[PDB]
Amino acid sequence: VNSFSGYLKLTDNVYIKNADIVEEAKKVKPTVVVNAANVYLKHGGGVAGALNKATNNAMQVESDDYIATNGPLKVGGSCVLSGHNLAKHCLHVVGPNVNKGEDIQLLKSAYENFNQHEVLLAPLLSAGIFGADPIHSLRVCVDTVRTNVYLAVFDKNLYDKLVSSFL
Ligand SMILES: CN(C(=O)[C@@]12CCC[C@@H]1C2)c1cn[nH]c1
């Protein structure tokens, strides 16, 4: 049993809810919240900007030190950093950004990072300002992630379309 409430069950391991991931993280304090990161961990907008704002910029400060030591992530890659006030840990995952011309086949590689964690609160990778089709992102998620994933979808309209169209 876990703390996650109000989710629709899509599969054995994937759950979905219309929710603000920031507000969901603040309520649940999950072991892992996933960030929709870029390779530079520059948390300007989208999910990343919202998560970072909720940490009062402490996520960005920590991320800048990580990049100064390690250099950029790979598209499809990830790193584990603090969850600050939102979670124990934040798994920063880089999905391909279609608005930069990145290979959508890298979306599967991005979701494979989730398999290193038993339970996660996450957004749909490469959705929103990353430009991918969220229906596609949900299909890749279901077909790739084997651990237990609780997806937060900010937009109610999109949530209802993801559920209604789910095979
Ligand atoms: C990425 N990077 C580094 O690899 C070095 C460069 C000289 C100082 C340390 C480790 C860096 C970025 N900003 N500041 C440093």
Swiss-Prot record:
Domain annotation Macro: ranges: 1-167
Domain of life the protein comes from: Viruses
Catalytic activity: Thiol-dependent hydrolysis of ester, thioester, amide, peptide and isopeptide bonds formed by the C-terminal Gly of ubiquitin (a 76-residue protein attached to proteins as an intracellular targeting signal)
Regulation: Inhibited in vitro by GRL-0617.
Cellular compartments annotated: Host endoplasmic reticulum membrane
Membrane topology, record value: Multi-pass membrane protein
Impact noted for substituting S164L: In strain: Gamma/P.1
Protein function: Responsible for the cleavages located at the N-terminus of the replicase polyprotein. Participates together with nsp4 in the assembly of virally-induced cytoplasmic double-membrane vesicles necessary for viral replication. Antagonizes innate immune induction of type I interferon by blocking the phosphorylation, dimerization and subsequent nuclear translocation of host IRF3. Also prevents host NF-kappa-B signaling. In addition, PL-PRO possesses a deubiquitinating/deISGylating activity and processes both 'Lys-48'- and 'Lys-63'-linked polyubiquitin chains from cellular substrates.
Quaternary structure and partners: May form homohexamers. Interacts with N protein.
Protein name in the entry: Papain-like protease nsp3
Organism from which the protein derives: Severe acute respiratory syndrome coronavirus 2
Positions spanned in the full protein: 1025 to 1191 of 7096
